[PDB]
Design a protein around this nucleic acid. Sequence first.
RNA 1: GGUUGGCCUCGGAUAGCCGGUCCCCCGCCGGGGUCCGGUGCGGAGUGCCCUUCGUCCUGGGAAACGGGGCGCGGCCGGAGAGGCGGCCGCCCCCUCGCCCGUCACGCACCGCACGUUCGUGGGGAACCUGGCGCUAAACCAUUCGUAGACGACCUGCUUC
RNA 2: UGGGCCACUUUUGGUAAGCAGAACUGGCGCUGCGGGAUGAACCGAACGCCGGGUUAAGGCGCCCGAUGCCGACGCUCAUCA
RNA 3: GCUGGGAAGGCCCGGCGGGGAAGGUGGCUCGGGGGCCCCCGAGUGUUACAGCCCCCCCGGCAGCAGCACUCGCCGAAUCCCGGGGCCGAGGGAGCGAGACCCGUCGCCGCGCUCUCCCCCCUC
Lengths: 201, 125, 139, 109
Amino acid sequence: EVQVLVLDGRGHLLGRLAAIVAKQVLLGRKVVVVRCEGINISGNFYRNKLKYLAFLRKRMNTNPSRGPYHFRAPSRIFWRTVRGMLPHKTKRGQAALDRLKVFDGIPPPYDKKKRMVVPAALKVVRLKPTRKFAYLGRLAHEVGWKYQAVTATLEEKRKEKAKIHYRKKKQLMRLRKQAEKNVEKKIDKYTEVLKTHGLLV
Amino acid sequence: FLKQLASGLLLVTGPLVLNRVPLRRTHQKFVIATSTKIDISNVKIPKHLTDAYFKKKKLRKPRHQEGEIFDTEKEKYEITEQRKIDQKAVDSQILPKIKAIPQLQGYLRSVFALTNGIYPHKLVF
Amino acid sequence: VFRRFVEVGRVAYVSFGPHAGKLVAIVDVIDQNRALVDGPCTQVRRQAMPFKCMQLTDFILKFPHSAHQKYVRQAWQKADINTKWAATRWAKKIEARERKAKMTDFDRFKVMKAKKMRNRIIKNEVKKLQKAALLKASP
Amino acid sequence: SGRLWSKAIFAGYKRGLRNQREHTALLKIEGVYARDETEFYLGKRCAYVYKAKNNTVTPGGKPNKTRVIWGKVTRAHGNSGMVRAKFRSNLPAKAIGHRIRVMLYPSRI
RNA sequence: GGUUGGCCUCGGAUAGCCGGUCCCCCGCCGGGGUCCGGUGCGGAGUGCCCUUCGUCCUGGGAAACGGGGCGCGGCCGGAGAGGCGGCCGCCCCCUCGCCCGUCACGCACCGCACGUUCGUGGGGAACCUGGCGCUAAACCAUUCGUAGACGACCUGCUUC
RNA sequence: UGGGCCACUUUUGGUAAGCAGAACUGGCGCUGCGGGAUGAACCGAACGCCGGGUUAAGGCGCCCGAUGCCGACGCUCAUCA
RNA sequence: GCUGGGAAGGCCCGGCGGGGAAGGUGGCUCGGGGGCCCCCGAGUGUUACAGCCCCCCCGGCAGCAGCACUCGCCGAAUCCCGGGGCCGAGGGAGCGAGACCCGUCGCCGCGCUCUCCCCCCUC
Ligand SMILES: [K+]
Ligand SMILES: [K+]
Ligand SMILES: [K+]
Ligand SMILES: [K+]
Ligand SMILES: [Mg+2]
Ligand SMILES: [Mg+2]
Ligand SMILES: [Mg+2]
Ligand SMILES: [Mg+2]
Ligand SMILES: [Mg+2]
Ligand SMILES: [Mg+2]
Ligand SMILES: [Mg+2]
Ligand SMILES: [Mg+2]
Ligand SMILES: [Mg+2]
Ligand SMILES: [Mg+2]
Ligand SMILES: [Mg+2]
Ligand SMILES: [Mg+2]
Ligand SMILES: [Mg+2]
Ligand SMILES: [Mg+2]
């Protein structure tokens, strides 16, 4: 679509979410992924940590400053995973990669906006409940990431402000339900039209 | 929709009062037939309303070969008084049947559009 | 935690497959994945059926397992499921979802008009309630 | 007073992995994510509308910078709602991931 | 050169959830314990909101505690990238705008495409038009030697 | 032209060899194309310049066309799967 | 159309019955609960205050590879209609008038008239 797609990274498997996001950006869609620290990877944590430590070992022996760049932030880790699923050495792939914005936590532009979910990449449906998984935030923290604590504090601040918004939203909805009861005689004419056509059961 | 003409073109009137569409020809391949219908039986569509009636007319370019003085006159197409009489005759007997069932004139008065939620293949017309 | 159980006489709603949208009664169970399934009053003859296309309802019929279709129909007709089903919120949401899909262009226009007036009257009254509740002057 | 056309995306050309057939294009129509739903759009006129630098004549209007390459949907591609389209001229590769309009013109309904 | 309405947000669980209400505890709202509902999610994103032909006579309903002012002035909230959102005071106008009807009219351009928006779009020179405002540095040259292959770098140059 | 080489199978020397030597058919050499990421020999198939349809072998998370099937039944957790 | 001249199945409480049982109904016994009355578990066993399988002395009705989507192979035992896509190569087809304005022509399949009556709409 023409609008930006904002996806919540919590509870989403890394590769499965990256595959969906990669095809979306190749189709001209702007995608924003927030809470990349909440992304999950299947398999126990130690095993997934070994995979990144093996990644850390791959470096140019002659000059590591030129070699593979190992990004430790969860947002950049997810960004690199998507980059491995795009033709990033062509102009089409670079254009697609520039349509992806990745964030740790939820920054102020997107904290006030509704966030989508990809069921085909969710851990609850894609992974057996008895299997072990790893958190991208924990994996990032123990391999070099430096902002797990500050992101946690800011995410806790954001959650407190969101609860206040939800209580106002719930108070507004309660008032709307009371309003519907109050004006029922002057509404049943239009209520009946809605019911005949499947709206407002 | 009133009748199909001898060339297969459809004769349509959106009651000119309702949506400013006169008695006009149209092509069935470029229309969407909705399921809502009004009974226009026992109405009289005038006999002279044929393809020759609705066929376009032109002026240029007789008695004139070299174009130095513009022949762009007449371009204001004029509604023939016969066309107004025929439009008045058909509408006078279709409009009452449109007014019979509720809020059909308002339906004819609005235009059709695609909203970002709906898709044409999912729509029942 | 669990309230709805696969059992003999349990009425299930078919979500997809050749018999989607029908109600069936579970007559017997086989191999954990399939069940002997029979809807005599809903036009589903006895046959195997995966548990994946079933969605259990709250209705349980009383008949012995692997009983003949006649006894299942008698149990289905006595305390009839068809009328009880149609009265549930589950069924009338299915029906409401069906009539909304079959809504024509004219009906969409009239719904758009009714919704417009209904929302303006409701949203007026919301403002009035808000303004009224705003008069709170007390220690 | 309305969009009057369906939103579609020029995903790419009909192709193998290592061979590209540019004469036909694969379009992704919004809201059509299964092959059985592509029946409505078969034969429908599709247009790639873009802008250029020099003015060009507009049918029934003053010249402007809008250009268009017309086409039509030919058949369904795959099982997930893709359609194949033929345009009078092969679509430029710069249009991949951009808007294609499906006109609804040749209506069969 | 793209685009052809918007969605302004609980936290989350999934062998469970969501909503509402009386007592208890926290300084008038949250937090718990009852109790009542919903759960193939209907307080539903398979959703919601807005909905565009325009006017003229003309009645019934909705409202009338209303609307709209790039009208001013004041205030509050937002810092993770706040680049945003909200509330008052005064003023200035419409009784219109929303639904159902009456009444006719508008280029009805004579079947036809790129129509319809964002949009007063982004960027660069330049003219006119008013108000409020500003009057600086960098580099070279010189000097220094905490520096130095050359560049580069650290320094000084009318005042007490 | 009279340097050949490779593969299934049979087969001699050798511990063995992408080694050396035979038999048979096919191939590469002389051959492009689809597939095997990549590759003389493998699998499919051999080629004038094109449009449409359909396939072979091979595939259909994304790169990268195609499962975005409410696919079926099981097995498997690996701190070198 | 064929098949095991389909297999199952539906209705006729299938009726006169017989037998078998168990993933055991009722009842009874034992063990745990709700205000000596009502539930759950474990035994017993042959209808009971459910049902299941086989044989019948025999079945009857409908339907029939089902428009209650359980499981096939087919069409001289097969026809009708519709939609989308690509394409339009060729250019003197006249045994006839003795062609004359441009061969509406060959093969094939049909209709009417040179027979007469009616019938139904329409002028
Ligand atoms: K435009
Ligand atoms: K020779
Ligand atoms: K020789
Ligand atoms: K055809
Ligand atoms: Mg030689
Ligand atoms: Mg030799
Ligand atoms: Mg050898
Ligand atoms: Mg050798
Ligand atoms: Mg050679
Ligand atoms: Mg050869
Ligand atoms: Mg070859
Ligand atoms: Mg190859
Ligand atoms: Mg390989
Ligand atoms: Mg081809
Ligand atoms: Mg591949
Ligand atoms: Mg693909
Ligand atoms: Mg048959
Ligand atoms: Mg020709």
